[PDB]
Amino acid sequence: YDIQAWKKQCEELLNLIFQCEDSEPFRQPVDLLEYPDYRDIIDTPMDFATVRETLEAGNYESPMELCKDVRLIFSNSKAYTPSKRSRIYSMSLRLSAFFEEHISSVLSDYKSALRFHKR
Ligand SMILES: Cc1cc(F)cc(S(N)(=O)=O)c1
Numbered sequence: 001y002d003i004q005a006w007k008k009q010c011e012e013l014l015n016l017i018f019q020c021e022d023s024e025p026f027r028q029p030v031d032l033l034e035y036p037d038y039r040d041i042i043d044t045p046m047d048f049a050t051v052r053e054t055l056e057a058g059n060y061e062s063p064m065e066l067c068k069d070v071r072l073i074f075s076n077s078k079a080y081t082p083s084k085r086s087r088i089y090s091m092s093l094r095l096s097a098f099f100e101e102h103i104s105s106v107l108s109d110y111k112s113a114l115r116f117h118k119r
C-alpha cells in the first residue's frame with residue numbers, strides 16, 4: 001500500500017523502454033526539419049525524454065498522468081502515420097503493447113494504495 005512506489009516503478013519501466021530498439025523513434029521530439037508538416041497534424045508532441053524529465057522534475061502527481069503522456073506518444077504515431085504498415089508506426093504498436101503489459105500493475109497498485117489510505 002505504498003502510495004509513492006509508482007515513481008520508481010515508472011523510472012524502471014522507462015529505463016527498459018529506452019534500452020529497447022523499438023523506442024528509438026520516440027526517445028526525442030519528432031524532427032520538424034524531417035517532417036515539416038508535423039504540427040499541422042499533431043497538436044501536442046510528446047516523447048519519452050519529455051516523460052522521463054517530467055517524472056524526474058516531480059511534475060507528475062500520479063502514474064495515471066504519466067500513462068496519459070505515454071499514450072499520447074503512441075496516438076501521435078497513429079495520427080501521423082500515412083499507412084498502418086509504416087516502419088515507425090509498426091514499432092509504436094510493439095512498444096505500446098510492452099508498455100501496457102507493464103503499466104497495468106503500476107496503476108492497480110497505486111489505486112489500491114490510495115483506496116487503503118482513504119479506508
Ligand atoms: C519486448 C521487450 C521490450 C522492451 F522494451 C524490453 C524488454 S525486456 N527484455 O527488457 O523485458 C522486452
Ligand SMILES: Cc1cc(F)cc(S(N)(=O)=O)c1
Pocket residue numbers: 030035076077078080081082083086087088089092
Ligand atoms: C513521425 C512519424 C511517425 C509515424 F508513425 C510514421 C511516420 S512516416 N515515416 O511513416 O511518415 C512518421
